A paper describes a structure:
The [name] ligand is sandwiched between the two nanobodies, which pack against each other in a face-to-face and largely antiparallel manner. Overall, the complex buries a total of ~1400 Å2 surface area among all three components with about two-thirds contributed by protein–protein interactions. As an inducer of protein–protein interaction, [name] is completely sequestered at the center of the nanobody dimer and snuggly fits into the central pocket constructed by the two immunoglobin β-barrels. Although a small channel can be found connecting the central pocket to the solvent, it is too narrow for [name] to enter or escape without the dissociation of the two nanobodies. As expected for its ability to bind [name] independent of [name], [name] is characterized by a surface groove formed among the three complementarity determining regions (CDRs) and the framework of the nanobody. In an extended conformation, [name] is embedded in this overall hydrophobic groove with its five-carbon alkyl side chain secured by CDR2 at one end and its p-menthane moiety vertically seated next to CDR3 at the other. Its central resorcinol ring is stabilized by a hydrogen bond formed between one of its two hydroxyl groups and the side chain of Asp34 in CDR1. In contrast to [name], the [name]-contacting surface of [name] is noticeably flat with only a minor depression created by CDR3 that accommodates the methyl group sticking out from the p-menthane moiety of the ligand. At one end of the [name]-binding pocket, CDR3 of [name] and its nearby framework residues directly pack against their equivalent parts in [name], thereby completely burying the p-menthane moiety of the ligand.
Residue numbers in the entry:
A (entry chain A): 1 to 120
B (entry chain C): 2 to 120
The structure:
Amino acid sequence: SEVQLQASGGGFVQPGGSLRLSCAASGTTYGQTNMGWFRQAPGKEREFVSAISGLQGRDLYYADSVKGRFTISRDNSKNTVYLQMNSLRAEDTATYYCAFHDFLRMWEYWGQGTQVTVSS
Amino acid sequence: EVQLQASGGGFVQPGGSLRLSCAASGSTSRQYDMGWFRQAPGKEREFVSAISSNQDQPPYYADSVKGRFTISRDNSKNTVYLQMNSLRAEDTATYYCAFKQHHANGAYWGQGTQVTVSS
Ligand SMILES: C=C(C)[C@@H]1CCC(C)=C[C@H]1c1c(O)cc(CCCCC)cc1O
């Protein structure tokens, strides 16, 4: 019928801090594993942070602004994907949303947004 | 309601080039993604490329087309272009344009365009 995304993570850190987000897809996913995160910074257009597809992590995508600092990964034991956010910067402050890209339904499911605040 | 109109596509010899275009009209906000999917016989819709109205955002290419396809936007016209170079027989498929505002969960699905590369 519908997909459900259970997200975890978020917090308040200082510049250079580190946080991990997680997202677990369930429901009638039909085995699709097209996952990612987008963020919504105050006053900006949404920015798709990272995407991954397949059990083997093809079509790996990172926004330029997070390359080298963010890593998306899967642990297939859980159908859980993770976003490791290292060396966080002030401009990373945003609401972060896990996304599930449904290419049967042509539908982007969103997790519950989670605030990440990076400030001195 | 959003409506999509595609153009381009057809038959090419291997190593040849094609240009697809897709123009979104209507309720399209200014904040949206557009891109291309392709579907070969007996296969699912496969992601090809996408581009955002956010120009801090670099375009996204599937591994299977990186280096050969180039997506670009005419914000003027709410129209995106896919420059498909060095086409191989494996690129043969119905290619579909797709559109999704940034605020929406449901994408709009465009009308398919045959791309056949052969011999
Ligand atoms: C309209 C496109 C391309 C599709 C349509 C179908 C679905 C389920 C989602 C859309 C989509 C994005 O909306 C955004 C991305 C990632 C970022 C792209 C550009 C940086 C992938 C992505 O499949």
